[PDB]
Amino acid sequence: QVQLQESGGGLVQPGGSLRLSCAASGFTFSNYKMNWVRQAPGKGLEWVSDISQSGASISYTGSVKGRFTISRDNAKNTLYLQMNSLKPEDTAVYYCARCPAPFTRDCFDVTSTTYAYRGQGTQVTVSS
Amino acid sequence: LSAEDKAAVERSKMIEKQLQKDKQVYRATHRLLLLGADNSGKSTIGIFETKFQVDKVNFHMFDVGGQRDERRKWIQCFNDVTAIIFVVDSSDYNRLQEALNLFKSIWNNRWLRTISVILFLNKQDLLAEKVLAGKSKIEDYFPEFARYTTPEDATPEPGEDPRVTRAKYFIRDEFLRISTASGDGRHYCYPHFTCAVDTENARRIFNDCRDIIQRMHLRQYELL
Amino acid sequence: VQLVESGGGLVQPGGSRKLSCSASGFAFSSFGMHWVRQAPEKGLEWVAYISSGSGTIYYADTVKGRFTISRDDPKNTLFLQMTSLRSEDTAMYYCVRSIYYYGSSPFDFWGQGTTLTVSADIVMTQATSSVPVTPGESVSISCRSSKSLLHSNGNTYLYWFLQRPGQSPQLLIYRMSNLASGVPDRFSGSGSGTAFTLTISRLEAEDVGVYYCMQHLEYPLTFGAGTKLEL
Amino acid sequence: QSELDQLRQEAEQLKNQIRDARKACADATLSQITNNIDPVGRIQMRTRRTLRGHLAKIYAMHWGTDSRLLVSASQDGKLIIWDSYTTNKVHAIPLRSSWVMTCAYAPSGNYVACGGLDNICSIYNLKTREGNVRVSRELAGHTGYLSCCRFLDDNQIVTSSGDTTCALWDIETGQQTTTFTGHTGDVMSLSLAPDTRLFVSGACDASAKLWDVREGMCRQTFTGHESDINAICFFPNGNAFATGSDDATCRLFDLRADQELMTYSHDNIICGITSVSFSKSGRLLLAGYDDFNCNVWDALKADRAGVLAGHDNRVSCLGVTDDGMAVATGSWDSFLKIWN
Amino acid sequence: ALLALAVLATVGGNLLVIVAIAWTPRLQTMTNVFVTSLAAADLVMGLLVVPPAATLALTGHWPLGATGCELWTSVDVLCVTASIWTLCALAVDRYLAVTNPLRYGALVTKRCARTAVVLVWVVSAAVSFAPIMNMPYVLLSSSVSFYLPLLVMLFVYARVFVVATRQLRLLRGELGRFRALCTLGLIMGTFTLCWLPFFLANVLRALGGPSLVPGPAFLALNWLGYANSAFNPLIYCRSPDFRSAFRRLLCR
Amino acid sequence: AQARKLVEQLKMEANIDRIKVSKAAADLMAYCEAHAKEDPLLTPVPASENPF
Ligand SMILES: CC(C)NC[C@H](O)COc1cccc2[nH]c3ccccc3c12
Numbered sequence A: 001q002v003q004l005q006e007s008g009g010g011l012v013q014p015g016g017s018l019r020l021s022c023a024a025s026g027f028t029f030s031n032y033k034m035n036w037v038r039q040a041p042g043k044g045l046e047w048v049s050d051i052s053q054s055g056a057s058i059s060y061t062g063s064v065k066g067r068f069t070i071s072r073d074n075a076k077n078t079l080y081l082q083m084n085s086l087k088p089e090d091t092a093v094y095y096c097a098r099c100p101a102p103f104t105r106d107c108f109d110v111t112s113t114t115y116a117y118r119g120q121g122t123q124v125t126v127s128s
Numbered sequence B: 001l002s003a004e005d006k007a008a009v010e011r012s013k014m015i016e017k018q019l020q021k022d023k024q025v026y027r028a029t030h031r032l033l034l035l036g037a038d039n040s041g042k043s044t045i046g047i048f049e050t051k052f053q054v055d056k057v058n059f060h061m062f063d064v065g066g067q068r069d070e071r072r073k074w075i076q077c078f079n080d081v082t083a084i085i086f087v088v089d090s091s092d093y094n095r096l097q098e099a100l101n102l103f104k105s106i107w108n109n110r111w112l113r114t115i116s117v118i119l120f121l122n123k124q125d126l127l128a129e130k131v132l133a134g135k136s137k138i139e140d141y142f143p144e145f146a147r148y149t150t151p152e153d154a155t156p157e158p159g160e161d162p163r164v165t166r167a168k169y170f171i172r173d174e175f176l177r178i179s180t181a182s183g184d185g186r187h188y189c190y191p192h193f194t195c196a197v198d199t200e201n202a203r204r205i206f207n208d209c210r211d212i213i214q215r216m217h218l219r220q221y222e223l224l
Numbered sequence C: 001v002q003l004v005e006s007g008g009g010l011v012q013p014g015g016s017r018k019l020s021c022s023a024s025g026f027a028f029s030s031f032g033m034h035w036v037r038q039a040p041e042k043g044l045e046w047v048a049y050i051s052s053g054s055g056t057i058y059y060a061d062t063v064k065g066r067f068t069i070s071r072d073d074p075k076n077t078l079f080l081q082m083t084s085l086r087s088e089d090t091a092m093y094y095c096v097r098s099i100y101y102y103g104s105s106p107f108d109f110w111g112q113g114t115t116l117t118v119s120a121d122i123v124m125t126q127a128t129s130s131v132p133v134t135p136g137e138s139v140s141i142s143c144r145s146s147k148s149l150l151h152s153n154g155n156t157y158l159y160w161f162l163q164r165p166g167q168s169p170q171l172l173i174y175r176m177s178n179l180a181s182g183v184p185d186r187f188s189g190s191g192s193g194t195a196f197t198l199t200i201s202r203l204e205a206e207d208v209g210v211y212y213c214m215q216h217l218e219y220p221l222t223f224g225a226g227t228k229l230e231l
Numbered sequence D: 001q002s003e004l005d006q007l008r009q010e011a012e013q014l015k016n017q018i019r020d021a022r023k024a025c026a027d028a029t030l031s032q033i034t035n036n037i038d039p040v041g042r043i044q045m046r047t048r049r050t051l052r053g054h055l056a057k058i059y060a061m062h063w064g065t066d067s068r069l070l071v072s073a074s075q076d077g078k079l080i081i082w083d084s085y086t087t088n089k090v091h092a093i094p095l096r097s098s099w100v101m102t103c104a105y106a107p108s109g110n111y112v113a114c115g116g117l118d119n120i121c122s123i124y125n126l127k128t129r130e131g132n133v134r135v136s137r138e139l140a141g142h143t144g145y146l147s148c149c150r151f152l153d154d155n156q157i158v159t160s161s162g163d164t165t166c167a168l169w170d171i172e173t174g175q176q177t178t179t180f181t182g183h184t185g186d187v188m189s190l191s192l193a194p195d196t197r198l199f200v201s202g203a204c205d206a207s208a209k210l211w212d213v214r215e216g217m218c219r220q221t222f223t224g225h226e227s228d229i230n231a232i233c234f235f236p237n238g239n240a241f242a243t244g245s246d247d248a249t250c251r252l253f254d255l256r257a258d259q260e261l262m263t264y265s266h267d268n269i270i271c272g273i274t275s276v277s278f279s280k281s282g283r284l285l286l287a288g289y290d291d292f293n294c295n296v297w298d299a300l301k302a303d304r305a306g307v308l309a310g311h312d313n314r315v316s317c318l319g320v321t322d323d324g325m326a327v328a329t330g331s332w333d334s335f336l337k338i339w340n
Numbered sequence E: 001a002l003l004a005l006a007v008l009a010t011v012g013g014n015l016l017v018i019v020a021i022a023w024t025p026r027l028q029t030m031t032n033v034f035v036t037s038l039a040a041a042d043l044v045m046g047l048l049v050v051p052p053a054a055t056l057a058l059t060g061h062w063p064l065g066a067t068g069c070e071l072w073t074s075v076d077v078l079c080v081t082a083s084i085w086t087l088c089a090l091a092v093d094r095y096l097a098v099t100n101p102l103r104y105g106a107l108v109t110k111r112c113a114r115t116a117v118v119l120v121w122v123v124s125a126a127v128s129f130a131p132i133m134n135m136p137y138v139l140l141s142s143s144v145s146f147y148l149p150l151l152v153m154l155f156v157y158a159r160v161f162v163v164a165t166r167q168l169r170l171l172r173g174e175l176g177r178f179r180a181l182c183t184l185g186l187i188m189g190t191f192t193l194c195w196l197p198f199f200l201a202n203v204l205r206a207l208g209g210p211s212l213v214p215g216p217a218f219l220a221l222n223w224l225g226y227a228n229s230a231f232n233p234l235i236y237c238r239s240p241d242f243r244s245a246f247r248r249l250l251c252r
Numbered sequence F: 001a002q003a004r005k006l007v008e009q010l011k012m013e014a015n016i017d018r019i020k021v022s023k024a025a026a027d028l029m030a031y032c033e034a035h036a037k038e039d040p041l042l043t044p045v046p047a048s049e050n051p052f
Helices: B003-027 B074-078 B096-107 B124-132 B162-180 B201-220 D003-025 E002-023 E031-048 E050-058 E066-099 E101-107 E110-129 E135-175 E180-208 E215-236 E240-251 F004-014 F021-034
Strands: A003-007 A017-025 A034-039 A046-051 A058-060 A068-073 A078-084 A092-098 A122-124 B029-036 B048-054 B057-063 B083-088 B116-121 B189-193 C002-006 C016-024 C032-038 C044-050 C057-059 C067-072 C077-083 C091-098 C114-118 C124-126 C139-145 C158-163 C170-174 C187-192 C195-200 C210-215 D047-051 D058-063 D069-074 D078-083 D088-094 D100-105 D111-116 D121-125 D134-139 D146-151 D157-161 D165-170 D175-181 D187-192 D198-203 D207-212 D217-223 D229-234 D240-245 D250-254 D259-264 D273-278 D284-289 D294-298 D304-308 D315-320 D327-331 D336-339
Touching (some): A003 A092, A017 A034, A034 A068, A034 A078, A046 A068, A046 A078, A046 B096, B003 B029, B003 D078, B003 D088, B003 E101, B048 B201, B057 B201, B057 E101, B083 B096, B096 B116, B116 B162, B116 B201, B124 B162, B162 B189, B189 B201, B201 E066, B201 E101, B201 E135, C002 C091, C016 C032, C016 C114, C044 C067, C044 C077, C057 C067, C139 C210, C158 C187, C170 C187, D003 F004, D058 D327, D078 D111, D111 D146, D157 D187, D165 D187, D198 D240, D229 D284, D240 D284, D250 D284, D250 F021, D259 F021, D284 D304, D284 D315, D284 D327, E002 E031, E002 E215, E002 E240, E031 E050, E031 E110, E050 E215, E066 E135, E066 E180, E066 E215, E110 E135, E180 E215
Parallel strands (some): B029 B057, B083 B116, B116 B189, D058 D100, D058 D315, D100 D146, D146 D187, D229 D273, D273 D315
Antiparallel strands (some): A003 A017, A017 A078, A034 A046, A034 A092, A092 A122, B048 B057, C002 C016, C016 C077, C032 C044, C032 C091, C044 C057, C067 C077, C124 C139, C139 C195, C158 C170, C158 C210, C187 C195, D058 D069, D078 D088, D100 D111, D111 D121, D157 D165, D198 D207, D207 D217, D229 D240, D250 D259, D273 D284, D284 D294, D294 D304, D315 D327, D327 D336
């Protein structure tokens, strides 16, 4: 059973640091591209970052470019998202998302409203 | 073979003749898949099927809009279309990254890897107005816009700001970078700047499909 | 479905007459059409056949060359051009529809017919050409054939027809075992090669008439002499 | 977090309880249960027939109950009924919508069904007085594309849609008598049981549910795949089924054991399964992959017993006759092949 | 000895090509219609043309009767003309597919392909058997059978070459922001290097008299075209699709 | 009540009775062995009896 349990979210003052972890179970981690998505309140789902099966290819949105860094560790079957210099625009619940198919470079329908291979969420709220 | 078996065989032969007539009708028709966002404005350009006619060539455009937001399965049915028409909203910078991600997924899709994409940056007038105003800045959603200068090949339209040229060509070069990052020449991206009042989009689709199939014939004849 | 025949009438022995068969209620272009005649004192006799799309035409040896057949699918009309008639041609000509595919029911519909009066074959024999029966009692009627109709493909091409007095005949059994549409289960078809029988259970009204057996193995179509079920 | 915490926790425990129950019931794996039987050897199946009338890729096919007539749907928007024995085209049915992703052959043989991106199941009468195949009932009410449709009887049909729902219809009234809900993603396939009192459906949530047709409820839910399930097929016994997913693995789930019994995959197979089927005895599990080749799996030993190579594009559909004489395989190269 | 190898290469290759096209429903793509016409022409070259010539060369005695040679020469002229006109047809098909792809989708149909093949073979038979029904005839026959189709193919392939090179340079520019020569030269070089010396010496003999070009040289040139007929399957069927069909055919 | 249906479905699935996997595998074995003779794919029929 595909289970994506992710945690690490809490109340942090602006400009702080936060590490988000996503423990993945029920599938072979090393053959799936992994994604980070968020849903700021009052808005819809949006993509944040992705990392290839091995980790050579990594991309991020312009908003989170240079401050968010995503790393995967296939040994423990987990996904990381180290966040630095948090801003009040970054308050959102963060989901950990997986490509629908293995050995592929096209995460389709990851940011959909009801995606099966997506975690519950961590409420990451940054305010002063 | 009995008399009835012979008659059944004949009937099958007439069915095959009708199938050949349908083959003649069907091969000459070029199929185009219309994708875009809710605000993309692709309606102007359930299933909303369109059939237009340019220079005696039959085009059949399909705008699937009766499904859910999950399109990883029903999009494989269009593995054999002539081209995929991708419509984006150039003015909305917030959803520009979503459009880029959709374009990347379509480009790198195992089955849509052989399909060329006609790119229609739709709301050029809105983009120009937004750039001229101080409503928002591209660099917020795309910090690389700082270190980017208008391409040498960029042809501005008369009476247009250089900053509008910078914005529109950066938006077009994001898609172009995604498209030429892979694919090794099996399929190509065709970028176009569009307006809501534009009437030459049919001619653009005609020319770009002509180029697509010309390159397909060259590749199948081993002429590159 | 409705088939309309016209053109029958008083014709001299030396002359010509064109027979028309108008189609209404079915895809006339996808059906193979037949012409089957019947003299006042004689059973049915197959005269000609034009296939769907006019791709194949067959004629009876008695009128081979003498007659011509054709169809007009756009107009949904069937034509039989007859030249140099004979005194033996006095008969009611029936326009019959038949579509051929796996599991189809050929000879399903027969036109009302037009009456025309003139001033290497499989023989089918129907024993007991005139018998009296009583309603409410089962009956058995058997027609046998010179050559076995089974084609080694489980296809004993025998067909049963019911000509009630005053109307065209209708198909009851096709392939010797399959009941046609609109035909009640009381009818039963069975038999083997070169010997077939028709079984009726609980005889009732609308069954009085003449029961014909017809072979469709090969095209020299031949019909039995008639059984004449009577009360 | 009120509901978001309480319901999430109760579920999390319930899932742990199910997992513990499956672990307790897992007395011994089927593989060892059958580690002593003779190898089924190699089943070399040669292309006996090749039906070539379709104009584009073939999405689906279905066999008649008589194991001789078959229907097939294609991208050209046409439905063709074949006589497999003689290659004859019994019928060619033009379709209003050319994106039909499924077709169904009524068990009585009177009707045929078709549906796709138009979100409508269309029923075509074959035995009509007019002599031409005419559409009789257009079943509307689904809000997504129709992945699959299967005839319960001459008046009832079960369809699965990409709106995360399966429905039981009534062709007479044209309305849904039952709607089956619970799937998270699109339902890509459905398989009717031999007794037809219940059916299973594979969705894009990597799970397959067993629905009781009468009560309209999900009796059981099976997990174990990690990618969208594309193919589903009920075991001939009716107490098990097999699923084909994009993980490139096939799994056999037992209704009574409520868990996967065996995974049919190899390390070098990296292509998802588009269709699966069983034989009459349920010993061979034929699976059509994206690698253009169909594999024949020993359903009891997990070792590949043969390859149905010969198709020059994706094997979209694959079905076995009710009498088990042949296997018809449709692919995206516009050709149907019959193998014996 | 090498002539036997050429004969068996011709017959095997062209029979295999014909068999593959006929039995593979996926290869019947309208242009294989011309390919199978050319393969038939080359097969009859290897069967009823080259064996008598090889036997005559390796053994002075003419294997065919005195009357048989007068219809064996008209099988030579028929088959060579048909092969060259089919090569021209294939060039024209490539031109229409590359320069007008959208319209070519239905510009040349099955009716047009089977009319063009029939017209090619009818013209070949007419040119071949016209003598049955000299210097002017040799000139006119060589112009109709070789020089006119050669000029047509040169114009056609020049246009295809400029189109292909423009598209290649455009593509390289497109991909570089962030071979037609080999293929066309192969196609034209085989056909030219094989049938141009013979049809040039033909005009030379016709104009300056038979004494100018010696027989053995004439035989050698005609025996170079036969090599062309052998080599035709190699160059018009080197596609992954054709190779798949050949592999599937010859494995089993 | 968004997850109330999910928790109710999980409870309903938990309510069922699960038999031993060894027994299920043995039953599948029994069916496959009993019906092996009538499987044309398993043991190919003679070419005379093959309709194709
Ligand atoms: C004469 C026999 C021994 N050999 C002929 C060549 O194989 C092919 O020659 C031709 C092909 C096509 C047109 C042609 N016109 C000619 C006129 C004179 C001689 C040969 C040819 C000829």
